[PDB]
Amino acid sequence: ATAAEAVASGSGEPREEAGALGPAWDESQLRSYSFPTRPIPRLSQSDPRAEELIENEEPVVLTDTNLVYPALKWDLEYLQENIGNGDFSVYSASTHKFLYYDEKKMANFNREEMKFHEFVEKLQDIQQREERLYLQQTLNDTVGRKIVMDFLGFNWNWINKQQGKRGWGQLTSNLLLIGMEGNVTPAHYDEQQNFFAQIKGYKRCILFPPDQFECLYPYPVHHPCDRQSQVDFDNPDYERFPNFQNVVGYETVVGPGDVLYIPMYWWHHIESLLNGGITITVNFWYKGAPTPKRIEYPLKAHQKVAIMRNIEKMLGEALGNPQEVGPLLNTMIKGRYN
Ligand SMILES: [Fe+3]
Known part of the structure; x- marks a missing residue:
């Protein structure tokens, strides 16, 4: 209510795709949440603002990096033919919300390895036959020839230069993610710096800054859900989590070509558009710059x-x-x- 502002413009009026091909996505494709949001800025990689945001550890969407330019062609037929005969991690859910567990931490207090063509089949299957799957596999040598080529055509000049400009540590992994429309990764924070490179379909990314720790309520450190919010965003329990009523987010919708900088310790909640088709993303994770001397x-x-x-x-x-x-x-x- 009042101040009466409209800086809660969310991710905004949807972009027009080239060649009058219509609205990329529709508002009806967003899930509906309790809290207000302000837009992540969408900028040219050559915009000195964008260097400013990243320098300052604030999220930004870069629309024109060509980071994963050769992967825009990627889709299921092309991956199954070229990703190779490796084991892929595949997470399942009864619900739209995926909840992930640290497996070492379960001593204290569902994943399934399979081949790509099995993931595609299970997926192929469901569409004909409620079940949701989510492939999330870090990339290795088992990938075949064409994926290695694709990969070598990624914009290493650009990201190498960000690694160095920022003083970051090493690139630790690239993870491929392939999700079904409606899939939700619920709010959590990662301790590494992230370039989240969108490839196919549209994902809505809701971020919160590290200063909202008190509003988001993570699990104990020793719980298998370490770094995730205890709060159910589709049914917030305000008695348990009263400062969730003060939560303010930064949101955006990423499509093919876009890269989202998720700064280290920023909360994010990532959802694949309702009725949007499969989503594909590749992440680039780096260690942050060392803690200064004093x-x-x-x-x-x-x-x-x-x-x-x-x-x-x-x-x-x-x-x-x-x-x-x-x-x-x-x-x-x-x-x-x-
Ligand atoms: Fe994450």
Whole structure:
């Protein structure tokens, strides 16, 4: 309500595709959430603003990098013929919301390897025969000749230069993601810097800054859902999560050609447009620039998230049981700091 502004323009009036081919996507294809959003800026890679945003660790969409230019041709027939005979990780859900688990962390408290043509079949199958799948596989040597070529034509000049301009560490992985229309990756944060390169179809990316930690409520560090929000965005429990009513997001819709910089520790929620077809994305993950020699004050939001993560981990080791972390922390604050 009031101030009365319309800076809550969301991801905005949909783009017109070239050659009068109509609206890329439609508002009816968005899921409906409780909270307001402001647009990520869409910029030329040659726009000095865009270098400014990334320098400053703020999200930006670059519309013209040609990062994954040779992969625009990618689709299911072309991948099945060329991706090779490797094992691919394939996540399934009964619901539209995918929930992921750290498997080492389950001791404390569904994935399936298969070949591409099996993923395509299961997928081929469902369309003829409620079930949702999500292929998410980091890329390796098992990929065949044409994918290696495609890959070599990616814009290494551009991204190499960002790696160096920013002081980042090494490229740790590229992950291919192939999702079915309507698929949701719920809100979480990654601790690496991300260029999220869209290839086929449209994904709506809702981001929140690291200073909304208090509104988003991640699972304990030792839980298998570490780094994800406990909050169900389609049914927020305001009694448990009262500061979710103060959440403000940055949103955009990425299509083929676009690259979204997701800065390190930024929350994101990624959904594949309703009735949009399959989505394909490749991510580029880098380690951030080292922590400087001596600190500066004020601390950045992400540094205080780092600090909180490490109090929970240490307390896990000290007590000898991560289930005791919470009782000690409560005993520490109650009637003392709250
Ligand atoms: Fe992520």
